[PDB]
């Protein structure tokens, strides 16, 4: 890898600099290089990895949606192959980023993650990147089931090992609820999960410090916002 000659600590430092400079492709390359050093990632490093790739794939998803909408309009309407070709180009790039992230999780972040806060984080990530693959899949069934399976394993661990207000647990449940609503054509399951997650977190807020309360309630607000959209 092109980052093979750079020290792990320098890759982490440069990932933080790239974040400050809003250079998320660089940030993702630095964090991929850090993962490939073979050592486990700390909490801060796991979040740097996620921030970097979420920003990269987020731009790709936004572009894909614009192009897919243009393509759908063109197929009702005067024609050429260019819209499809360019949508396909962006799609292929997006799939490549998702495959890269999934590859890092499979080689070998998940297998070395034993603590709940690392293992749930990575399994959630696996679900997320399969979900992004599912958004563009048309094949789709197995990708959907791979997302589901990863989220379910993460959920099972999170419910046993984390309090209901843990931000990773909350973010996992939020994203699994989005999976149900947007991918799996299961809006009722989405609503039920969001409601139960919100209510169980509410009941655990009393145990938290002011700073943890702020973190947990911020994520709970997204569950509430989705429930408002969905009902």
């Amino acid at each position: 890898g092109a980052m093979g000659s750079m020290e792990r600590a320098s890759l982490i430092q440069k990932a933080k600099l790239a974040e400050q400079a809003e250079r998320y492709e660089d940030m993702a390359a630095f964090m991929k290089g850090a993962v490939e050093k073979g050592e486990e990632l700390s909490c801060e490093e796991r979040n740097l990895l996620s921030v970097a790739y979420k920003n990269v794939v987020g731009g790709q998803r936004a572009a894909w949606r614009v192009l897919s909408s243009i393509e759908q309009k063109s197929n009702e309407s005067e024609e050429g192959p260019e819209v499809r070709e360019y949508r396909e180009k962006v799609e292929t790039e997006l799939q490549g980023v998702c495959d890269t992230v999934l590859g890092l999780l499979d080689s070998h972040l998940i297998k070395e993650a034993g603590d709940a806060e690392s293992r749930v984080f990575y399994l959630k990530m696996k679900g997320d990147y399969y979900r992004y693959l599912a958004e563009v899949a048309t094949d789709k069934k197995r990708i959907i089931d791979s997302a589901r399976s990863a989220y379910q394993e993460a959920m099972d661990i999170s419910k046993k090992e984390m309090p209901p207000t843990n931000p990773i647990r909350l973010g996992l449940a939020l994203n699994f609820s989005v999976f149900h609503y947007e991918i799996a054509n299961s809006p009722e399951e989405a609503i039920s999960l969001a409601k139960t997650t919100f209510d169980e977190a509410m009941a655990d807020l009393h145990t938290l410090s002011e700073d943890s309360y702020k973190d947990s309630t911020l994520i709970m607000q997204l569950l509430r916002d989705n429930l408002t959209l969905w009902t």
Partner: peptide, 9 residues
């Protein structure tokens, strides 16, 4: 479109 988990601000 539904809201998914956000990065910490």
């Amino acid at each position: 479109r539904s809201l998914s988990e956000r990065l910490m601000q």
